[PDB]
Amino acid sequence: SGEYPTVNEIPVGEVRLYQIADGVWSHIATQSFDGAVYPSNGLIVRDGDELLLIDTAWGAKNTAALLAEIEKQIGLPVTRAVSTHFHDDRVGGVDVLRAAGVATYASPSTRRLAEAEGNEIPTHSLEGLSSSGDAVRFGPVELFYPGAAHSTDNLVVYVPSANVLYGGCAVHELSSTSAGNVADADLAEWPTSVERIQKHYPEAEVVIPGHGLPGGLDLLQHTANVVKAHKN
Numbered sequence: 514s515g516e517y518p519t520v521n522e523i524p525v526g527e528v529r530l531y532q533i534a535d536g537v538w539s540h541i542a543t544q545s546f547d548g549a550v551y552p553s554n555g556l557i558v559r560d561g562d563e564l565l566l567i568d569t570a571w572g573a574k575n576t577a578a579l580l581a582e583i584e585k586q587i588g589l590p591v592t593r594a595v596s597t598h599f600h601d602d603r604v605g606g607v608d609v610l611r612a613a614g615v616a617t618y619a620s621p622s623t624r625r626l627a628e629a630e631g632n633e634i635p636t637h638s639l640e641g642l643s644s645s646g647d648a649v650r651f652g653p654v655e656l657f658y659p660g661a662a663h664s665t666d667n668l669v670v671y672v673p674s675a676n677v678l679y680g681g682c683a684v685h686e687l688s689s690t691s692a693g694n695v696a697d698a699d700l701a702e703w704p705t706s707v708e709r710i711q712k713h714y715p716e717a718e719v720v721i722p723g724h725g726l727p728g729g730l731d732l733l734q735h736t737a738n739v740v741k742a743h744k745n
């Protein structure tokens with residue numbers, strides 16, 4: 514009923530959208546992994562009379578439900594998708610997207626890692642993102658590679674029309690008391706990568722984490738704090 518939807522409010526298999534700004538939504542889904550249930554976020558950005566999708570809804574059936582929810586709530590076709598790193602909450606569902614006519618994209622680093630892990634593999638490679646600090650335009654967004662953080666390949670996404678920063682899994686929500694799933698992370702480099710985000714996007718008004726509630730720029734400093742303390 515208008516609040517940001519939380520893990521126990523979304524049954525696994527259902528998707529909800531949340532309006533972030535004019536022409537910007539997040540998508541929220543839930544998934545079971547190793548016997549626990551987690552929420553995760555992605556982004557939808559209006560691209561004229563088409564939509565750009567950022568990240569799957571964490572699984573094939575969730576991603577089919579995402580496409581149905583978009584049709585119900587927005588009614589414009591999803592034509593392109595970008596996955597912001599190689600984990601299943603970002604690429605799981607790419608095969609569903611690819612069969613629904615969506616062109617799927619990721620960095621070459623993400624594509625390699627997805628392939629090596631046995632995860633679904635986006636079709637198209639995004640060049641120009643291999644060195645930290647790199648940025649490229651992709652429709653109505655800018656894609657930015659901040660350096661290694663949650664994963665070596667993680668990308669963040671900025672919507673300049675709305676000053677929306679989608680941090681993906683390199684950014685944690687304010688209530689986080691832990692650095693999440695760090696199996697593929699670089700805890701030593703993560704603060705430096707967050708500092709790069711802070712320097713590059715000082716006018717961000719909304720910051721969206723990969724999991725949990727959006728907020729403001731404080732999510733960036735909070736993330737650095739939880740990562741340093743996790744390492745400590």
Ligand SMILES: C[C@H](OCc1ccc(CN)cc1)c1cccc2c(-c3ccc(CS(C)(=O)=O)c(Cl)c3)c(C(=O)O)[nH]c12
Pocket residue numbers: 546551600601602663682685688689690691692693694695696697723724
């Ligand atoms: C799909 C992804 O696969 C990762 C993976 C890696 C390696 C292997 C081995 N090949 C297998 C799987 C995955 C699965 C399950 C949970 C997560 C979480 C997660 C997010 C927030 C919290 C709350 S908190 C207060 O700590 O911030 C917590 Cl506990 C966890 C994240 C995330 O941090 O991005 N990613 C997750």
Ligand SMILES: [Zn+2]
Pocket residue numbers: 598600602663664682
């Ligand atoms: Zn991840």
Ligand SMILES: [Zn+2]
Pocket residue numbers: 600602682723724
């Ligand atoms: Zn994640």
